[PDB]
Ligand binder design. Structure first.
Ligand SMILES: NS(=O)(=O)c1ccc(C(=O)NCc2ccccc2)cc1
Ligand SMILES: [Hg+2]
Ligand SMILES: [Zn+2]
Length: 258
């Protein structure tokens, strides 16, 4: 019935209900490093997450989201290719069933184990609902994850997963600091795109960090034990919740470094 990542309702079927899937600025895309244009007029990114307020973690089928209180300018994103202030509303991951796949964006065709999306909306629009009606409504910060050493800042997330194993389940998740998930460098690529899951609205400025973070094998293993299904229903492991790379069409990927 509803969309999913299975053979019968996966990405290749999304176009039947969501015509925009075959639009002009769809995401994710493949980042060809030898073609990205170094743009010196790009300002440095300004991430202010010191006053962030996490509230809850939930399994909504598809993936698990950590939600923040965005009633005020608490955790914001400015600078880079952005014009205005963007508020953090939530973060989630996309991962695979094996370590060699899981990320949505690819670099020179290279797939990573997973990808973290920190979702923000443009404050000049009032609420997120109005923001998704504008070409510059959202800004998503994407971070790649590779299997290596453990990431301390991620463990608090890994520990609570058991309590939200099935669809619709949530758990209180306060006092989490998203700063613990950032790589050392803030160098990035950027291009105009869209949400990667239905309704696939093209209202996103994508900012993809060049430097990936490392997460241990055991940390990623716990992501893989979640369920797409709700309590009582037959078990379907939540793995490979990622959309394949889409054609770039008439867009240019700019780089803040060289
Ligand atoms: N993977 S990703 O960062 O691109 C992404 C970010 C946000 C959303 C979202 O808010 N969805 C709900 C929703 C419901 C109705 C209209 C718009 C969005 C979905 C995907
Ligand atoms: Hg829009
Ligand atoms: Zn996402």
């Amino acid at each position: 019935h509803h969309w999913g990542y299975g053979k019968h309702n996966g990405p290749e079927h999304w176009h039947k209900d969501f015509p925009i899937a075959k639009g002009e600025r769809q995401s994710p895309v493949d980042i060809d490093t030898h073609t990205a244009k170094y743009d010196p007029s790009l300002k440095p990114l300004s991430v202010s997450y010191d006053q962030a307020t996490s509230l809850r973690i939930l399994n909504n089928g598809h993936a698990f989201n950590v939600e923040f209180d965005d009633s005020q300018d608490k955790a914001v994103l400015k600078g880079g290719p952005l014009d205005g202030t963007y508020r953090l509303i939530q973060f989630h991951f996309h991962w695979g069933s094996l370590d060699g796949q899981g990320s949505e964006h690819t670099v020179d065709k290279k797939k990573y184990a997973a990808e973290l999306h920190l979702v923000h909306w443009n404050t000049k629009y009032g609420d997120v609902g109005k923001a998704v009606q504008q070409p510059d409504g959202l800004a998503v910060l994407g971070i790649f994850l590779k299997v290596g050493s453990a990431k301390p800042g991620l463990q608090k997330v890994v520990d609570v997963l058991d309590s939200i194993k099935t669809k619709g389940k949530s758990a209180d998740f306060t006092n989490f600091d998203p700063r613990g998930l950032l790589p050392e460098s803030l160098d990035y690529w950027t291009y105009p795109g869209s949400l990667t899951t239905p309704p696939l609205l093209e209202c996103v400025t994508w900012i993809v960090l060049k430097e990936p973070i490392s997460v241990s094998s055991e940390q990623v293993l716990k992501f893989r034990k979640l369920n797409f299904n709700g309590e009582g229903e037959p078990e379907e492991l939540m793995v490979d919740n990622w959309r394949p790379a889409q054609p770039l069409k008439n867009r240019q990927i700019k780089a803040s470094f060289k």
